[PDB]
Amino acid sequence: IVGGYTCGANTVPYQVSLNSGYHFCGGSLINSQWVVSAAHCYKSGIQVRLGEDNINVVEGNEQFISASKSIVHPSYNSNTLNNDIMLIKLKSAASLNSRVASISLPTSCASAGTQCLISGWGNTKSSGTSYPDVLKCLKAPILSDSSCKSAYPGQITSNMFCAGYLEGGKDSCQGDSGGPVVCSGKLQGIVSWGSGCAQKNKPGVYTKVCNYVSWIKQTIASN
Ligand SMILES: Nc1nc2ccccc2[nH]1
Ligand SMILES: [Ca+2]
Secondary structure, three states: OEOOEEOOOOOOOOEEEEEOOOEEEEEEEEEOOEEEEOHHHOOOOOEEEEOOOOOOOOOOOOEEEEEEEEEEOOOOOOOOOOOOOEEEEEOOOOOOOOOOOOOEOOOOOOOOOOEEEEEEOOOOOOOOOOOOOOOEEEEEEEOOHHHHHHHOOOOOOOOEEEEOOOOOOOEOOOOOOOOEEEEOOEEEEEEEEOOOOOOOOOOEEEEEHHHHHHHHHHHHHHO
C-alpha cells in the first residue's frame, strides 16, 4: 500500500496473509472455512495466516491453517486478468472472535464515489521496494467507469473497477494482490492489477465481487 497508514493491530479482522515461507498475497475471510483471493495468487503449498498484524513476529492472535483446496475461477484469463478471483478452503475452520472475523459479501454493486478501505502488506514505495512488517490501510473511492476506461482503454471488462486517486501518491501495489476492498461493510473488490503503483492517472484495478456472489455461493455449497 503506497501513501496509506498503519491500520492498528487487528482492526481489519477479515484480512489474511497467504504464506509459502514468505507473504505473497492477501485475501479475505468470508466464513470460518473459506477465503476469497485473486486467481493470480494461485500456487500449491499455501498456508493461510489469520489474525496477523506484524507478519514477521508471532504476537498472539495468529491462526496458521493450511489450505485444503484452491479453486481458481474456470474462466480466469491470465493475459487479461478477467475473472481474477479464487476461493481457498481451509483444512479446518478458523475460530472467529473480535480479532478474526469474516466480512460480508455484497447484495448490490457499489457506485462511483463510494469510499472503501483497502489493506495489505504489499510494497509501500512506487519507485522501489519496501515491504512493511505490519498491516497498512488506505481509504480510496471507486472511480466512474468512464475515468477507469479512459485510464486503461481496451483493458477494463465488466468484472473490474478502478479505485484510487488520479493525482497518484496513494494506491495498492505488489504484495497487496488478492486482498480486500471493503465499502460500507461489504467486500466489493479484490486487489488485482494496475500500471505501476501510485502513478498519476493509473489507478488500481479491482475484481468486481458483486458479479460473483452467486458463483461463490454455488461453489462453496458444492465443495
Ligand atoms: N495499483 C496496483 N495494484 C497492484 C496490484 C498488484 C501489482 C501492481 C499493482 N498496482
Ligand atoms: Ca505476527
